[PDB]
RNA sequence: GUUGGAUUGUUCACCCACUAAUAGGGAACGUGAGCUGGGUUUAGACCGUCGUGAGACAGGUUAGUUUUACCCUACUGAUGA
RNA sequence: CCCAUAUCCGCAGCAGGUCUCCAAGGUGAACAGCCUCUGGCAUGUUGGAACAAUGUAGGUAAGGGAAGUCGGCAAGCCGGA
RNA sequence: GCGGUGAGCCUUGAAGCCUAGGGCGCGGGCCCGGGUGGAGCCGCCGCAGGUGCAGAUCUUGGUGGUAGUAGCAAAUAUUCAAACGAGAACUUUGAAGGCCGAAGUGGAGAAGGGUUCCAUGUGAACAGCAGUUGAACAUGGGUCAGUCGGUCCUGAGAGAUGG
RNA sequence: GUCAACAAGUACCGUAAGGGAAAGUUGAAAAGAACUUUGAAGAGAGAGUUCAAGAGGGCGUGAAACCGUUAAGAGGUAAACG
């Protein structure tokens, strides 16, 4: 449509989005962030072993509360989780981008993923009732999501 | 999300009334 | 697939409760297939619709 | 205002941080003051802490109450392998402290030593040591080596050996050895050097450390509890029963002013596994291992000349989460810190014993060894055999 | 280091007993998102005195809801840089 | 058709509130409490893994036996015949 | 905003908005370049005001930090296999293990609700996890009386007419 | 500006008397995206319409607070400022 980062050339790159995806924002930023800059196959092999809880997220930015992992001086971090909605809707996507590119003709075993981002989606309204005869905002932060695939070998 | 001025006046009363009873004059 | 209509229409023709209806569960879409009292009556002549019987108490040991 | 009735301040100031312990071995910080006049011999040992028994013997204090009477005393059981010396190192005198000056290692160093210094000895190609192993059969490799004593034996003043224990003849899980370093007094540093390398690549049995009846000092690592809260770590009173949002507390932590928390405050947090060093633990037994002599072994390390059974230090059944003692041990007095199987180091005290409770010749009579795995009633196992009678499971 | 108690809401006081000693204070008359709520202590009630009365009493008596930390710091531990 | 720990009122699939009819076997004085049969249900708007502090609810405790506290508060003792 | 005036400006791009672009003014502010935009706008001379905002526990609307935190802990309890299905901790069937325990977590009503009843279909929202499930959404269907009630009667009481 | 430019005395609230909103704009024209392809679908990628989808059915223009991303610079006396 429209994207941040028009890529460097539109030939040997393809493309996905995905709007108001019912993930959560936050725990969906930090699972791009980990896939960012990584090559199609290592990212789909990392991205299914956050499911299995044998890699994990690291949180960086969105951690206030988020306890402390093994895995996660593998990042050099401390603190991570396994987000397995954020990794499973970033499998989807995932699979959908690399049929963009046999679509139009690319070796899906040489695609990076250059650009990715999460933004903020238009949020969804529930109530909660709460102490005396009170009613609260029980909100949902849906993502858009947007991907670059540029191949390169 | 509705609010009621109700729940507020009443409330108002047993934060005045707490302080009464908590409060030796 | 759900078979909580036919488990309801089988106490009814039958006079038992839902506890005691027996429903084949190798059969299990031939009773799919009945929704209504005739084809219940014919399941429970055939036999895939039994009703159970009543878990014993005995008065044995208060005898 | 001032508090009404003073009481003392509870816990101790002097052991603050109460943390966790960085190391696990337990480490010497302070060995005794070296001097030349004396015999070359070493300072410190290294043995692991195998379980607790009871003893009987008559005691000899003049004008005392149990003089020439029986006591029982509380033993303590530390199995203590020969330690094998692989290594010198010398520091040298510095107005910045002690800086390390040159390390020598052995030609043969063994795997039980080079597991110590792996991670992962499983995945790793065990390659340790090897490039510098060839400097003992090398020539222009050998001669860096005696310019190595040499320049350590006119700059150090201290000589420290580099030991290891021998985990195989240990029954426990682990095979990594622990390594020390246990620094050698008496004698001018040149006569301490040569005797250390003497001792290189072999062993040193306990009793050439060690003596019968001599106090020494234990350092290790105390039983780790976890996360405990005032009431457990620093022994503060119990709140009253109807008290609101709990009572296992302290209930103020501080004035108004200083505007903040002291120090000084008992507070939530690690209890034990700390690590501590406590003195003055009399030695009561140097006892020797299983040894294989006649084709049948002679295993009698508990017998005493007033109770000559056949018996072993092991009790029936075995110590209890420990297993179970073939090499030769110690039998200190009293409590000492740590789990079973904890290594403890111990070394000769710092200090000279004058006191008559120090220098007191003891000599047991009676070392139990019923089974600490319950209510124990037999000393051995023909003794049980010979009271119980033939069982049912015998006679099949 | 300077305590255990009887009476009292007590601070104080006084007494019993022990002890080497049973010193004096401060910290928003240290300390209530630490408690308790005994003294004071709103609305009920009784007595005395006062007031024509409604009522009053720096007099006695009895009954009377004690809220929140998940933020920053300090502190205690725990990773880590 | 619901007639209520989800069809009603309480802002809601809200531990509250809201008039009745029928009523098995054992124990026992008993429509008491406990266990079961007819009938009903899926633990009350989430699971999994751990077994730290602090809680909330429940227990036990040597030797003393109210010394605790404003106050035997709380618990314990007592119990049927 | 109005009366005048600039043979004013404008689809060859007005307003508006944005701008690490150029400048001017002591300042209020203004002019120009560029981008976006798509139809109107501005200068001088007078005229007239509902004429300039950081504040008012200001009004209405939006949005943060807190924070992926508090939390999703009252009433003992689940498990194995199969089926359907893109998908099963939660659906259905079977098997087990249990609880209500006849003053029921059972079977029917009065008030009150108003179609929730019953089928089939969906799978977005909603059912504070999830659903192949639903009291949700869609599409259809369903309440039969001389004897069961109302209806009739009077009760406490309400209420016209004559006055 | 009338509470009401619109399915407004409407929805909803209250036993009742009464109280009482929010909400205008695709484009000239629906030409409202055929077809292919991944997915269970929502959603995408191409293709197409139009002067324009940086006009895609709460759609003219599209500010700020706030957020993501890229780029550049920096970072132990909280930032900010003269
Ligand atoms: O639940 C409350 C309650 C407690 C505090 C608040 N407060 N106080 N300040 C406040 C400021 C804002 C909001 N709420 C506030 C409100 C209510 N109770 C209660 N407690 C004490 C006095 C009066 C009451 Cl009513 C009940 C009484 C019944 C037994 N259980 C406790
Ligand atoms: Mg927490
Ligand atoms: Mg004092
Ligand atoms: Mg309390
Ligand atoms: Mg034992
Ligand atoms: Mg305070
Ligand atoms: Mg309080
Ligand atoms: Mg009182
Ligand atoms: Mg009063
Ligand atoms: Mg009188
Ligand atoms: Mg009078
Ligand atoms: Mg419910
Ligand atoms: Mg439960
Ligand atoms: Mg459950
Ligand atoms: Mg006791
Ligand atoms: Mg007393
Ligand atoms: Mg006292
Ligand atoms: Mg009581
Ligand atoms: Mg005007
Ligand atoms: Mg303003
Ligand atoms: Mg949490
Ligand atoms: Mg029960
Ligand atoms: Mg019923
Ligand atoms: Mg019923
Ligand atoms: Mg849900
Ligand atoms: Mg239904
Ligand atoms: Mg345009
Ligand atoms: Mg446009
Ligand atoms: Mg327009
Ligand atoms: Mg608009
Ligand atoms: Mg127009
Ligand atoms: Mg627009
Ligand atoms: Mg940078």
């Given at each position: 449509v429209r994207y941040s980062l028009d890529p460097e050339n539109p030939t040997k790159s393809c493309k996905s989005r995905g709007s108001n995806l019912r993930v959560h924002f936050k725990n969906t930023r930090e699972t791009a962030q980990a896939i960012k800059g990584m090559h199609i196959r290592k990212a789909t092999k990392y991205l299914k072993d956050v499911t299995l809880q044998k890699q994990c997220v690291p949180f960086r930015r969105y951690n206030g509360g988020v306890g402390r992992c093994a895995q996660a001086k593998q990042w050099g971090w401390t603190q991570g989780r396994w987000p397995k909605k954020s990794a499973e809707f970033l499998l989807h996507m995932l699979k959908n981008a690399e049929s963009n590119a046999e679509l139009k003709g690319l070796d899906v075993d040489s695609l990076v993923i250059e650009h990715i981002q999460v933004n903020k989606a238009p949020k969804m309204r529930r109530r909660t009732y709460r102490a005396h005869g009170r009613i609260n905002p029980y909100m949902s932060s849906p993502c858009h999501i947007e991907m670059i695939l540029t191949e390169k070998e | 999300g509705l609010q009621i001025p109700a729940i507020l006046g009443i409330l108002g009363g047993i934060l005045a009334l707490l302080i009464l009873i908590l409060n030796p004059n | 697939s759900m078979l909580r209509l036919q488990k309801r229409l089988a106490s009814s023709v039958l006079r038992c409760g839902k506890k005691k209806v027996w429903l084949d569960p190798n059969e299990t879409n031939e009773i799919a297939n009945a929704n209504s009292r005739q084809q219940i009556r014919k399941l429970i002549k055939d036999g895939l619709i039994i009703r159970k019987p009543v878990t014993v108490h005995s008065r044995a040991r208060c005898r | 205002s001032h508090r009404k009735f003073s009481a003392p301040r509870h816990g101790?100031?002097?052991?603050?941080?109460?943390?966790?312990?960085?190391?696990?071995?337990?480490?010497?910080?302070s060995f005794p003051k070296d001097d030349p006049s004396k015999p070359v011999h070493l300072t410190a040992f290294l043995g692991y802490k195998a379980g607790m028994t009871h003893i009987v013997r008559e005691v000899d204090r003049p004008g005392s109450k149990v003089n020439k009477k029986e006591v029982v005393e509380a033993v303590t059981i530390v199995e203590t392998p020969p330690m094998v010396v692989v290594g010198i190192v010398g520091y040298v005198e510095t107005p910045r402290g002690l800086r390390t000056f040159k390390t020598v290692f052995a030609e043969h160093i063994s795997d039980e030593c080079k597991r110590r210094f792996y991670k992962n000895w499983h995945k790793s190609k065990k390659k340790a040591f090897t490039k510098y192993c060839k400097k003992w059969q090398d020539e222009d490799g050998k001669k860096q080596l005696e310019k190595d004593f040499s320049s350590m034996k006119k700059y150090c003043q201290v000589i420290r050996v580099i030991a290891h224990t021998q985990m195989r003849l240990l029954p426990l899980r682990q095979k990594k050895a622990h390594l020390m370093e246990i620094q050698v007094n008496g004698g001018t540093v040149a006569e301490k050097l040569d005797w250390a390398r003497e001792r290189l690549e072999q062993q040193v049995p306990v009793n050439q450390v060690f003596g019968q009846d001599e106090m020494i000092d234990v350092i290790g690592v105390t039983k780790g509890k976890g996360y405990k809260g005032v009431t457990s770590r620093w022994h503060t009173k119990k709140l009253p029963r109807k008290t609101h949002r709990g009572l296992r507390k302290v209930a103020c932590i501080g004035a108004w002013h200083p505007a903040r928390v002291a120090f000084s405050v008992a507070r939530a947090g690690q209890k034990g596994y700390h690590h501590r060093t406590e003195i003055n633990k009399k030695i009561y037994k140097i006892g020797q291992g299983y040894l294989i002599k006649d084709g049948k072994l002679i295993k009698n390390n508990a017998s005493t000349d007033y109770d000559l059974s056949d018996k072993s230090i092991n009790p029936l059944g075995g110590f209890v989460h420990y297993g179970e003692v073939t090499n030769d041990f110690v039998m200190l007095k009293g409590c000492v810190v740590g789990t079973k199987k904890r290594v403890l180091t111990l070394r000769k005290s710092l200090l000279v014993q004058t006191k008559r409770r120090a220098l007191e010749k003891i000599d047991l009579k009676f070392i139990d060894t019923t089974?600490?795995?319950?209510?124990?009633?037999?000393?051995?196992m023909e003794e049980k055999k010979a009271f119980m009678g033939p069982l049912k499971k015998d006679r099949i």
């Open positions: - | - | - | 101790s100031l002097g052991f603050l941080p109460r943390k966790r312990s960085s190391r696990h071995r337990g480490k010497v910080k089974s600490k795995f319950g209510h124990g009633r037999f000393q051995t």
